[PDB]
Design an enzyme around this catalytic site. Structure first.
Site, short mmCIF file in Angstrom:
data_model
loop_
_atom_site.label_atom_id
_atom_site.label_comp_id
_atom_site.label_asym_id
_atom_site.label_seq_id
_atom_site.Cartn_x
_atom_site.Cartn_y
_atom_site.Cartn_z
NE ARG A 76 -52.60 0.09 9.63
CZ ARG A 76 -52.36 -1.18 9.59
NH1 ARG A 76 -51.88 -2.01 10.76
NH2 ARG A 76 -52.28 -1.76 8.49
N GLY A 77 -54.04 4.15 13.50
CA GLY A 77 -53.70 5.51 14.25
C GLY A 77 -52.10 5.68 14.49
N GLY A 80 -50.92 2.86 16.84
CA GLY A 80 -51.27 1.16 16.61
C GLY A 80 -52.42 1.27 15.59
CB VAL A 82 -59.00 -0.35 15.53
CG1 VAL A 82 -60.30 -0.80 16.40
CG2 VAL A 82 -58.85 1.05 16.31
CE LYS A 97 -56.98 4.23 20.29
NZ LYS A 97 -57.63 5.64 20.29
CG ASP A 190 -59.72 14.70 16.39
OD1 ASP A 190 -59.73 15.56 15.46
OD2 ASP A 190 -59.37 13.66 16.29
#
Ligand SMILES: COc1cccc(CNC(=O)c2ccc3c(c2)OCc2cnccc2-3)c1
Ligand SMILES: COc1cccc(CNC(=O)c2ccc3c(c2)OCc2cnccc2-3)c1
Ligand SMILES: [Cl-]
Lengths: 377, 376
Positions: A76-77, A80, A82, A97, A190
């Site tokens: 989860r992001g 949205g 994956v 994704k 990141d």
């Protein structure tokens, strides 16, 4: 010839005017004009009547979310999720994704996916997750990638007490992976074990390139536990090398070097790294491992990796009797995943479980930022 | 799976397809043209899209065919929405006739769909009776159609410079009959057959031009001086084109149109009253077969010659001659072969702007023209 020069531009897969992008332009134009209020304009209404049948035919032929079966949500992001999917016709398994067009526009973050898609499509590197397809519908952008069934390095660290011989292998693989990204003129920004995935054989690949930035001619560009001091206080590649030091520390010690109960406490510890970094006395860490962690966890000006990767490669910590830098990805990995099927997602923690664009009175062009996203390998 | 990708690639390769590469580039060009205004650029979606496609669209504009690739020699024709210029391509040095159509006037006078069949007939007829189109391009103001130049001029010009003998009238009528049968065979009705639209090539042979009124027929076969009575009293068949042929044969032999009058209303009144208004002057040099053929065309649609096909017209006694057959007429010597002094000689042609306002919101004035571009 002018017609030959123009045909070469359309054939180029990196070109903004390739056939996939030209079809996106037509699809987006139809999507952004097919509203009752806009159809009052004769120019718009007649155009939609002319292109209605062909655009519906094109929509059925082109790749769509309905061509895949969703097996499970594995990530989860911000914009949205994956999903682990299976292509209905080929029966092949992928990680897909999804990015919400609505959330990307609302939260004014709708340009990060260009470099993410390009890195995965055109890296040609065993250290980068490969993208096979990039497609879209009215609500989402989709990125069909190779599935990494070994899970991430967060999962590895919680199920194993990592010995220094393993830490040496994973750090070396992260070093080669970041050198590949850096060679493409990019800074990750990141680097964290959540974005370090393991394949079917236990070897590393980087994922989540949503923060990647192309560096300028000077090699410069304009997560609390892994963030460097310079980003907390105009950053180069050595910003990614800081995160590698934090990662090597977390692997050997079992905790983050600047862990604190609050976010502000953690930021204060990172700024004070010259005095806040200390290895616990129980810690089973070698002198070479402490020296390597310390060479990464310094101010950007004197940090290891500022002058490329050759200085990192020759560090005494990496001396071993199993692999060389030129063959490390073709040697046996410390942990080889034990999978029971092509959809085994046991190395992924379970994920716990809606808005649309308002119907417009005039042309707004919500599909315009996504023209050119479609790509077929 | 791969069948879907094959089907899709076939659609884009097809030159008759609305999604060919030329049409897809028109979609991008038109989108940029219709959005590149300061007021519209206030929207972030629009402004960012234009910034992304700025360099590539400028590169495409310089590579694609444009009016600047041609030198205008002379204006040889004029029409409702533009003009036809005799031009020379700057790079190849080849001479063509280029028709121009104003996007502004076509939108303003709500007539912006006629050019589709016109472009398609000229691009894809593959007929010696139809003027060939090599290129169809467009800019922000005009649609362009680059066609083969017909240096012999039209049949209006021929009729004013010659007293046409019946042997010549027989040749030109037979060629118009074959040209019309070719259009009818492609599923179309011309609706404007007149000597102004009958051009002569470098060898004196006929080709039809101006397909702005052509219409595709249904499964039923249905859709001033030269218009039929049924067209005036307004569904039309192919026999309305055969009416026009009778008027043409009469004008060639007599020297005047059969329903000529000083005013447009006088002409319309005479065409409606054709049963009593048609009469051959006593000093007109015309055969009994020629009068019979004109009369078989100048009747009510129900009993008009050519309603049941061209075979009945071909076997008419008027066309009996010792010079040509229906299968070889275009390969026999024409009555008048043009004498031209250069590749830009336009001696067979008599000697012969408002823009869209800058918009405050998206109007899409370029949208009706997407798909016009064509390169042979
Ligand atoms: C900003 O909006 C979003 C939306 C959704 C996710 C993310 C972050 N997460 C990822 O980008 C992500 C996470 C896991 C995987 C991945 C990407 O690709 C390769 C792959 C292969 N096999 C298993 C898992 C993965 C960010
Ligand atoms: C409705 O808007 C317009 C605009 C402009 C012209 C017309 C009528 N005129 C035509 O369509 C036309 C077509 C082809 C030719 C021509 C005229 O005259 C010269 C000539 C010479 N060589 C080859 C072809 C031609 C109508
Ligand atoms: Cl005969």
């Amino acid at each position: 010839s002018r017609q030959r020069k123009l045909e070469a531009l359309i054939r180029d897969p990196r070109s903004p005017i390739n056939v996939e992008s030209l079809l996106d332009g037509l699809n987006s134009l139809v999507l952004d004009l097919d509203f009752p209020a806009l159809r009052k304009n004769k120019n718009i209404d007649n155009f939609l009547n002319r292109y209605e049948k062909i655009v519906k035919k094109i929509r059925g032929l082109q790749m769509k979310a309905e061509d895949y079966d969703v097996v499970k949500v594995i990530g989860r992001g911000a914009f949205g999720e994956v999903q682990l999917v299976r292509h209905k016709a080929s029966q092949k398994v992928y990680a897909m994704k999804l990015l919400s067009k609505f959330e990307m526009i609302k939260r004014s973050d709708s340009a990060f996916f260009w470099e993410e898609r390009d890195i995965m499509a055109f890296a040609n590197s065993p250290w980068v997750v490969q993208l096979f397809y990039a497609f879209q519908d009215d609500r989402y952008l989709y990125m069909v990638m190779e599935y990494m069934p070994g899970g991430d390095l967060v999962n590895l660290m919680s199920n194993y007490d990592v010995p220094e011989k393993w830490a040496k292998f994973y750090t070396a693989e992260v070093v080669l992976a970041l050198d590949a990204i850096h060679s493409m003129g990019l800074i990750h920004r990141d680097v964290k074990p959540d974005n370090m995935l393991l394949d079917k054989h236990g070897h590393l690949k980087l994922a989540d390139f949503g923060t990647c930035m192309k560096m300028d001619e000077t090699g410069m560009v304009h997560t609390p536990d892994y963030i460097s001091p310079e980003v907390l206080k105009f950053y180069g590649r050595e910003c990614d090398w800081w995160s590698v030091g934090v990662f090597l520390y977390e692997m050997l010690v079992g905790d983050t070097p600047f862990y604190a109960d609050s976010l502000v406490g953690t930021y204060s510890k990172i700024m004070d790294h010259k005095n806040s970094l200390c290895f616990p006395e129980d810690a089973e860490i070698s002198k070479h491992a402490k020296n390597l962690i310390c060479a990464f966890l310094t101010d950007r000006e004197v940090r290891l990796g500022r002058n490329g990767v050759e200085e990192i490669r020759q560090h005494p910590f990496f001396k071993n009797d199993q692999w060389h830098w030129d063959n490390i990805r073709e040697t046996a990995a410390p942990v080889v995943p034990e999978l029971s099927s092509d959809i085994d997602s046991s190395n992924f923690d379970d994920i716990e479980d809606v808005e649309t664009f308002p119907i417009p009175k005039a042309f707004v062009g919500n599909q315009l930022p996504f023209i050119g996203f479609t790509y077929y390998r």
